Scaffold this active site. Structure first.
Site, PDB file in Angstrom:
ATOM      1  CD  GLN A  96      -2.899  -1.233   0.128  1.00  0.00           C
ATOM      2  OE1 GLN A  96      -2.571  -1.397  -1.066  1.00  0.00           O
ATOM      3  NE2 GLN A  96      -4.163  -1.066   0.565  1.00  0.00           N
TER       4      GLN A  96
ATOM      5  CD  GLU B  71      -9.234  -7.815   9.426  1.00  0.00           C
ATOM      6  OE1 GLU B  71      -9.103  -8.782   8.591  1.00  0.00           O
ATOM      7  OE2 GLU B  71      -8.389  -7.494  10.358  1.00  0.00           O
TER       8      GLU B  71
HETATM    9  C1  LIG Z   1     -12.958   1.703   1.309  1.00  0.00           C
HETATM   10  C2  LIG Z   1     -12.046   1.214   2.385  1.00  0.00           C
HETATM   11  C3  LIG Z   1     -10.754   0.829   1.920  1.00  0.00           C
HETATM   12  C4  LIG Z   1      -9.877   0.377   2.860  1.00  0.00           C
HETATM   13  C5  LIG Z   1     -10.228   0.184   4.176  1.00  0.00           C
HETATM   14  C6  LIG Z   1     -11.554   0.499   4.641  1.00  0.00           C
HETATM   15  C7  LIG Z   1     -12.393   1.036   3.664  1.00  0.00           C
HETATM   16  C8  LIG Z   1     -13.789   1.490   3.987  1.00  0.00           C
HETATM   17  C9  LIG Z   1     -11.801   0.349   6.107  1.00  0.00           C
HETATM   18  C10 LIG Z   1     -13.224   0.175   6.581  1.00  0.00           C
HETATM   19  C11 LIG Z   1     -11.151   1.497   6.896  1.00  0.00           C
HETATM   20  C12 LIG Z   1     -11.146  -0.939   6.517  1.00  0.00           C
HETATM   21  C13 LIG Z   1      -9.629  -0.644   6.395  1.00  0.00           C
HETATM   22  O1  LIG Z   1      -9.301  -2.005   6.652  1.00  0.00           O
HETATM   23  N1  LIG Z   1      -9.267  -0.374   5.080  1.00  0.00           N
HETATM   24  C14 LIG Z   1      -7.912  -0.462   4.716  1.00  0.00           C
HETATM   25  C15 LIG Z   1      -7.615  -0.295   3.384  1.00  0.00           C
HETATM   26  N2  LIG Z   1      -6.386  -0.434   2.887  1.00  0.00           N
HETATM   27  C16 LIG Z   1      -5.410  -0.734   3.776  1.00  0.00           C
HETATM   28  O2  LIG Z   1      -4.217  -0.731   3.407  1.00  0.00           O
HETATM   29  N3  LIG Z   1      -5.637  -0.867   5.087  1.00  0.00           N
HETATM   30  C17 LIG Z   1      -6.912  -0.720   5.599  1.00  0.00           C
HETATM   31  O3  LIG Z   1      -7.042  -0.835   6.798  1.00  0.00           O
HETATM   32  N4  LIG Z   1      -8.555  -0.031   2.444  1.00  0.00           N
HETATM   33  C18 LIG Z   1      -8.193  -0.042   1.081  1.00  0.00           C
HETATM   34  C19 LIG Z   1      -7.321   1.010   0.488  1.00  0.00           C
HETATM   35  O4  LIG Z   1      -8.087   2.190   0.700  1.00  0.00           O
HETATM   36  C20 LIG Z   1      -7.147   0.817  -0.999  1.00  0.00           C
HETATM   37  O5  LIG Z   1      -6.398  -0.409  -1.151  1.00  0.00           O
HETATM   38  C21 LIG Z   1      -6.429   1.981  -1.672  1.00  0.00           C
HETATM   39  O6  LIG Z   1      -6.114   1.598  -3.019  1.00  0.00           O
HETATM   40  C22 LIG Z   1      -5.207   2.510  -0.898  1.00  0.00           C
HETATM   41  O7  LIG Z   1      -4.651   3.652  -1.524  1.00  0.00           O
HETATM   42  P1  LIG Z   1      -3.234   3.571  -2.261  1.00  0.00           P
HETATM   43  O8  LIG Z   1      -2.277   2.880  -1.309  1.00  0.00           O
HETATM   44  O9  LIG Z   1      -3.472   2.901  -3.602  1.00  0.00           O
HETATM   45  O10 LIG Z   1      -2.944   5.078  -2.445  1.00  0.00           O
HETATM   46  O1  LIG Z   2      -9.811  -3.929   7.972  1.00  0.00           O
HETATM   47  C1  LIG Z   2     -10.109  -4.184   6.818  1.00  0.00           C
HETATM   48  O2  LIG Z   2     -11.392  -4.566   6.446  1.00  0.00           O
HETATM   49  C2  LIG Z   2      -9.188  -4.049   5.649  1.00  0.00           C
HETATM   50  C3  LIG Z   2      -7.820  -4.009   5.674  1.00  0.00           C
HETATM   51  C4  LIG Z   2      -7.316  -3.833   4.279  1.00  0.00           C
HETATM   52  C5  LIG Z   2      -5.968  -3.787   3.825  1.00  0.00           C
HETATM   53  C6  LIG Z   2      -5.726  -3.587   2.472  1.00  0.00           C
HETATM   54  C7  LIG Z   2      -6.713  -3.571   1.559  1.00  0.00           C
HETATM   55  C8  LIG Z   2      -8.050  -3.630   2.002  1.00  0.00           C
HETATM   56  C9  LIG Z   2      -8.312  -3.741   3.337  1.00  0.00           C
HETATM   57  S1  LIG Z   2      -9.839  -3.839   4.057  1.00  0.00           S
END
Ligand SMILES: Cc1cc2c3c(c1C)C(C)(C)C[C@@H](O)N3c1c(nc(O)[nH]c1=O)N2C[C@H](O)[C@H](O)[C@H](O)COP(=O)(O)O
Ligand SMILES: O=C(O)c1cc2ccccc2s1
Ligand SMILES: Cc1cc2c3c(c1C)C(C)(C)C[C@@H](O)N3c1c(nc(O)[nH]c1=O)N2C[C@H](O)[C@H](O)[C@H](O)COP(=O)(O)O
Ligand SMILES: O=C(O)c1cc2ccccc2s1
Ligand SMILES: [K+]
Ligand SMILES: [K+]
Ligand SMILES: [K+]
Ligand SMILES: [K+]
Ligand SMILES: [Mn+2]
Ligand SMILES: [Mn+2]
EC number: 4.1.1.102
Lengths: 500, 500
Positions: free
Chosen positions: A187, A279
């Site tokens: 990420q 999650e």
């Molecule tokens: C829509 C959405 C996306 C994410 C998450 C949530 C939502 C609602 C939470 C509910 C907060 C759960 C959390 O687990 N969560 C989350 C997360 N990515 C992570 O690395 N870690 C996370 O904890 N993504 C996904 C990332 O947002 C995408 O993978 C995105 O592509 C990242 O941006 P980038 O690194 O490409 O700039």
């Molecule tokens: O707590 C969660 O549901 C998530 C953690 C992450 C990490 C990376 C991409 C999506 C998600 S969604």
């Protein structure tokens, strides 16, 4: 301040849409807010706005749940998402993902710096806030902390200043002035943290903005390429330069109408207990004992009557599915196209817990490649599972022209009837795996590696001469004149609104 | 003559249930009847009774479509099936499959021979009928013949007289006094045909009874063991000896209230063109050039105002799914139990086109076995895929106690989140395969062999210490007192019948 550019405007748009429930009686951030929001997401009900939150003090804060979840009607199923993007509430998934991809071959429109904004209406320093004294939700009963951060955007910038990333990553309150959160490879928040750690000089200047412009939270949820500043991608997508104000305590820039802003640092050295958390796949492992990244909060600025958006994530259907799943699918579609693969459409079926992506294939281009299932499977796999856009996806289903990949039932039909287990599949054990999937992190094999597959639901003639079947359904097994007669006489005979 | 014992009574029961549409204006057996029936099955509408069928002559015949298809309401979704069995229309799948399995450890109640019945009201000899002059339906536009036989029971008896089999197998009109049909291994009609062919003395005495007692057509659709006479199994299941009359031209016995009876022979030497046909998986391959078994018809006897039942099969949901899929699942549940496997429940998810069976596991018994996923997968596979009951099933999904296997969404959730592709699966390439599945018959590998898998969606602790997660859903991630408060206040706050 249109709805797609101003969170406060968006909340008014949901109210006007009759897609909001204003709860003005006291609601407990200890599970009650999230329980109501969870029930909303499981039933596709109206978004809850909690105007009266037990422990709200000095304007911090109201909560809006289910900001990007589904509406009950088929006709405007995706209207909440459409409202993030200035699209008609009747927009299709295809139209939403096309909008999100539109900026991929446009010049960025960089942001505009303004002297002030509504996010500066109130401030609390080092001495005036305590994160344990705010009405931060307990979202699931076994969560290992109160998850303040489920729908705000983290803002971090490369050491050389050339790349500013906006992204959602979860974070929970650790103590009066720290969060812990997920910061994991591949990420971009992790990639930038690694850059700062290798320079070794300081902790990462950081901000976390909640209630940002809806189009910016969409891009925050999408795996746009490495080195691409989300702000300018959103600018091009919307045609409007986003207005940003400088942080008070660092030189990062936050959306001027942000509801709530945390300023501080992301440690290059310290960790703290993080999770467990309920999650996106539908699970919590109570007592998991993970360490995560540690954030220090130096300052809070916020709007009068600040609204915190909250994702009560888990089983279908919430923002992890509608946004994180679908936007990964969109980026995979584009990645495939850029690698000269004849992919027209991609979607992460909700039925798969957004662990699958269905790839619709232009079979006329496929035929002209004079290839085979094994060769094509491998090439598709290699492209998607060796890129960051394929991170979260463990099964690719290839389907021909007749399948609408936005329709889970048709994906499951094609998968179940056209892909021979084993023989029509390729397994990928030397690719990065998504540990959050229970069969990875809590399964029989390596948490971070392998467990991926390309399932080929293309039929043999789709590679050679063309589809050699008709469906045994009403649409395909009866001539047009008869189908229209049946439909015209349906109620007359005794059998039983699009909007409804 | 209760509904479950008399087809005419069953049709009245559907009318009384408001689960029938009587069409009394002319309907064309060339596609129109089947198109209306297909639309019914795709929408879970009321069963169509075509009282006025273009080309009906001398009482042959009316058609009832969708006899075993689904009702729209959740509350009586399976009521048509319940009506086959004297169960309340609100019966669950579990209750229906339990009823169908109840006779497995009861003494047979053999049938009672009666001198006559309503099936003898009319007769047509060798010289008086022509099967091409009857209003036999064209069910799909590319079908290779008019499929007279989609919901009647074939009656054949072992050469030694000890086993009389009742079964559904498709058959189409070949000429004025022949059908061709599917007679394929391991099906009992095929096993008995093989017995006659090895004796080599004569063609198989045969009858085909349409509009038989509903409980008998259910057993006709179910893979009860080799050597078990369906008549006595239905007798035990219902508690009533079935009344049978002798054929006029052979010594086989047919249900006394059968709507329509064909008497003749199944050739031990001749074949004829058969199919293609729009099939249970949702496909037809127009022009397929298969040979099939050849039946000679010597006599027709029928009721006044005879009704032919018809399955307009294909894409979801029809009798191939509700009956053939579900009854195979039931028999697999029992087969597993008899092999000392801790299986409580089985169902063929409709989403899988009834190519999967989900096997619910009693994980307390599993823990006491002190086994592993690979060992257990192999043992389950070996039992089910080396038996006739596992014929049609290409994927077994093992799921723990928390999953309702009758709920496709929960099966897809467990499958998608708990089974690591490759590692948590075993492939079975040296077992009989079901060629009708397009990836078998029309796929990349052997039509009749392999392509089967056991997918283990049991989590690792389910083998050792017990489930180590809670679901991130409303049910499991909130305490009872809070869930009940949310539900009690739901409408008061502004959010939105079991029968509906
Ligand atoms: C829509 C959405 C996306 C994410 C998450 C949530 C939502 C609602 C939470 C509910 C907060 C759960 C959390 O687990 N969560 C989350 C997360 N990515 C992570 O690395 N870690 C996370 O904890 N993504 C996904 C990332 O947002 C995408 O993978 C995105 O592509 C990242 O941006 P980038 O690194 O490409 O700039
Ligand atoms: O707590 C969660 O549901 C998530 C953690 C992450 C990490 C990376 C991409 C999506 C998600 S969604
Ligand atoms: C419910 C139902 C079951 C079946 C069929 C249909 C329906 C509605 C048709 C619409 C007519 C399609 C026809 O393709 N079809 C069919 C068939 N079995 C075959 O060998 N051949 C067939 O052509 N089965 C399944 C068999 O009925 C069961 O496998 C049963 O177990 C057999 O009995 P037995 O050999 O165990 O005694
Ligand atoms: O024509 C069809 O749909 C079918 C043929 C067969 C053969 C055996 C088992 C089930 C079926 S269903
Ligand atoms: K992003
Ligand atoms: K295939
Ligand atoms: K049978
Ligand atoms: K597993
Ligand atoms: Mn990024
Ligand atoms: Mn049998």
């Amino acid at each position: 301040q249109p709805a797609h550019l101003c969170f406060r405007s968006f909340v008014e748009a949901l109210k006007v849409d009759n897609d909001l429930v204003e709860i003005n009686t006291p609601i407990d951030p200890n599970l009650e807010a999230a329980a109501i929001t969870r029930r909303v997401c499981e039933t596709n009900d109206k978004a809850p706005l909690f105007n009266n939150l037990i422990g709200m003090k000095n304007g911090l804060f109201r909560i809006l749940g289910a900001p990007g979840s589904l509406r009950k009607s088929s006709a405007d199923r995706y209207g909440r998402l459409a409202r993030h993007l200035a699209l008609p509430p009747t927009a299709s998934m295809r139209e939403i993902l096309d909008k999100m991809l539109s900026a991929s071959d446009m010049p960025p429109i960089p942001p505009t710096i303004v002297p002030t904004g509504p996010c500066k209406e109130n401030s609390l320093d080092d001495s005036e806030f305590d994160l344990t004294e705010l009405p931060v939700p307990l979202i699931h009963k076994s969560d290992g902390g109160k998850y303040i951060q489920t729908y705000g955007m983290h803002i971090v910038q490369s050491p050389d200043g050339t790349w500013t990333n906006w992204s959602i990553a979860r974070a929970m309150v650790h103590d009066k002035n720290h969060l812990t959160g997920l910061v994991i490879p591949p990420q971009h928040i992790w990639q930038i943290h690694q850059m700062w750690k290798k320079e070794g000089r300081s902790d990462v200047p950081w901000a976390l903005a909640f209630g940002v412009p809806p189009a910016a939270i969409m891009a925050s949820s999408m795996p746009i390429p490495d080195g691409v500043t989300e702000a300018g991608y959103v600018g091009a997508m919307t045609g409007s330069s986003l207005e940003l104000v400088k942080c008070d305590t660092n030189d990062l820039y936050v959306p001027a109408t942000s509801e709530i802003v945390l300023e501080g640092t992301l440690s290059i050295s310290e960790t703290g207990p993080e999770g467990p958390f309920g999650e996106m796949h539908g699970y919590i492992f109570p007592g998991d004992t993970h360490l995560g990244a540690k954030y220090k909060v130096n300052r809070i600025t916020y709007r009068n009557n600040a609204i915190m958006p909250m994702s009560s994530c888990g089983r279908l259907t919430d923002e992890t599915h509608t946004m994180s799943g679908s936007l990964a699918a969109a980026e995979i579609r584009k990645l495939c196209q850029q690698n000269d693969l004849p992919i027209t459409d991609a979607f992460a079926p909700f039925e798969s817990q957004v662990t699958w992506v269905a790839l619709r294939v232009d079979t006329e281009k496929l035929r002209a490649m004079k290839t085979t299932s094994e060769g094509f499977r491998k090439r598709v796999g290699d492209v998607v599972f060796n890129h960051k856009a394929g991170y979260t996806i463990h099964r690719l289903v290839l389907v021909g022209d007749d399948i609408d990949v936005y329709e889970g039932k048709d994906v499951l039909w094609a998968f179940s009837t056209r892909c021979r287990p084993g023989m029509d599949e390729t397994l990928f054990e030397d690719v990065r795996g998504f540990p959050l999937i229970p069969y990875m992190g809590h399964g029989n094999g390596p948490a971070h590696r392998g467990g991926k597959v390309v399932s080929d639901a293309l039929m043999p003639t789709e590679y050679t001469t063309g589809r050699n079947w008709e469906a045994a359904d009403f649409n395909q097994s009866y001539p047009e004149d008869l189908k229209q007669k049946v439909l015209d006489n349906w109620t007359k005979m005794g059998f039983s609104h699009h909007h409804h």
